[PDB]
Design a protein around this ligand. Structure first.
Ligand SMILES: CSCC[C@H](NC=O)C(=O)O
Ligand SMILES: [Mg+2]
Lengths: 82, 164, 88
RNA sequence: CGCGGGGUGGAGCAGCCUGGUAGCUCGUCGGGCUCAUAACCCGAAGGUCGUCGGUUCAAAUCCGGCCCCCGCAACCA
RNA sequence: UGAAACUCAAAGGAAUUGACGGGGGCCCGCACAAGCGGUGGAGCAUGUGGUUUAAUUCGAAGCAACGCGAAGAACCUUAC
């Protein structure tokens, strides 16, 4: 069901940030409001703090989660049990 | 309260249990029917969705009637409330006692309450005097389930028949 | 106004309860308060209901004579230990 | 300890007794009906029959233990 | 035979206009009947109630609120 024509979408907020940190090796906690962005393997390894709408929640990123947008790993709604 | 009767059974081979509790085994339907006819009492399929369909060789209608009778017996058993006053007239009290006795004889429980007002000084005492006296009078028909108990504006007791 | 030692409490499947007690201190009257103690924890606290000795129903039990006493609502029967009675 | 009887959807009761077959009323949940609540009517859920076990083709049911409840059981000074 | 204390700013009658009746009569409407096809049973689609949440924006209340304001909420809209 995955939705894009050609050229998979990453926003130039963290896209150009993480490639700079490819030269500093790794980095520590990149808080972005960008959850729209799909995972490219340039990010693989880093720590992305993604905006819940409230919390910049940390994500330790692996090669497996590549074909996914960032906000999937940021659970915005909480709880279900009553 | 309804089961397949004698000829209403189509299910091939039936568990031929008698009116007593005796097993003949897994006879054919027709054979079982014949047996029933011989013995008079019908073949009542009391468990069709079981390991061999449970055919009970009793008169179905008769059985039903018996059950109905039993149910009726069970029915007739009630709780009957007698409501005493605090400052008691004697004749009335006697009448109430008689009523209670009658109820007991019939088979019914008697809930004996005493209607209180304000004035909670000698009211509970009065209630005790009444209810206990009543119990004493009719101890041979009834035993006490609920002792003289305070409800605030009432004193309740329960007279239940000696043997049910 | 007395310290008593428990000798025989009574288990009746008919009548009631009677506590035979040896006085060590002073006197046990009929309208006195009672504390019942074991070796560690206190068993029961309350009052004296009934008083009736072997001879006659003596009002005060002086010196150290054994006297039965009925203890308001006694829950634990047959051989206690120390009964202490307090009164101002 | 004695003897007798009992123990069942949450509550009060039948069924055991006759070995196969678990009902009834009150409550709980949902609906309807009403303007709305009760009442009413409907459904829906809910018991393994104190339990250990046996029996027997199969036990709430027959038997026993233990657990209990209940009644009676002769001693208070 | 017959009070008062106390208490209320009324208790009342007759009629009148209505409204009302498991009063009456005369009528009517898919109101029932007669008939067809559904909803309630299933899944989902919605809107609400309720409950969660950092917020589940607010309103609409029986018919005449509930596929409604919304005749187009990813952001916008959007008020949270
Ligand atoms: C110490 S036993 C006490 C019993 C009591 N006195 C005497 O017999 C009655
Ligand atoms: Mg209702």
């Amino acid at each position: 069901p995955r939705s894009l024509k050609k050229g998979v979408f990453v926003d130039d907020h963290l896209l150009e940030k993480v490639l700079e940190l490819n030269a500093k090796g790794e980095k520590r906690l990149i808080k972005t409001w960008s959850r729209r962005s799909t995972i490219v393997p340039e990010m693989v390894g880093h720590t992305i703090a993604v905006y819940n709408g409230k919390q910049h929640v940390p994500v330790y990123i692996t090669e497996n989660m590549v074909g996914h947008k960032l906000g999937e790993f940021a659970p915005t709604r909480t709880y279900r049990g009553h | 309260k309804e089961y397949l009767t004698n000829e209403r059974i189509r299910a091939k081979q039936v568990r031929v249990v008698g009116p007593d509790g005796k097993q003949l085994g897994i006879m054919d339907t027709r054979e079982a029917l014949r047996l029933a006819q011989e013995m008079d009492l019908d073949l009542v399929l009391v468990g069709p969705n079981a390991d061999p369909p449970v055919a009970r060789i009793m008169d179905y209608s008769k059985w039903r009637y018996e059950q109905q009778m039993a149910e009726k017996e069970a029915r007739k058993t009630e709780v009957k409330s007698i409501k005493f006053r605090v400052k008691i007239d004697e004749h009335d009290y006697q009448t109430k006692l008689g009523h209670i006795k009658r109820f007991l004889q019939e088979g019914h429980k008697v809930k004996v309450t005493i209607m209180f007002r304000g004035r909670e000084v000698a009211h509970p005492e009065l209630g005790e005097r009444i209810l206990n006296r009543v119990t004493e009078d009719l101890k041979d028909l009834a035993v006490v389930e609920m002792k003289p108990e305070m409800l605030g504006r009432d004193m309740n007791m329960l007279l239940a028949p000696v043997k049910v | 106004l007395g310290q008593a030692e428990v000798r025989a409490i009574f288990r009746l499947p008919t009548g009631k309860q009677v506590a035979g007690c040896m006085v060590t201190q002073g006197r046990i009257p009929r309208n006195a308060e009672v504390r019942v103690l074991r070796d560690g924890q206190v068993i029961w606290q309350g009052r004296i209901a009934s008083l009736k000795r072997f001879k006659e129903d003596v009002r005060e039990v002086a010196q150290g004579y054994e006297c039965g006493i009925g203890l308001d609502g006694f829950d634990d029967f047959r051989e206690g230990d120390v009964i202490e009675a307090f009164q101002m």
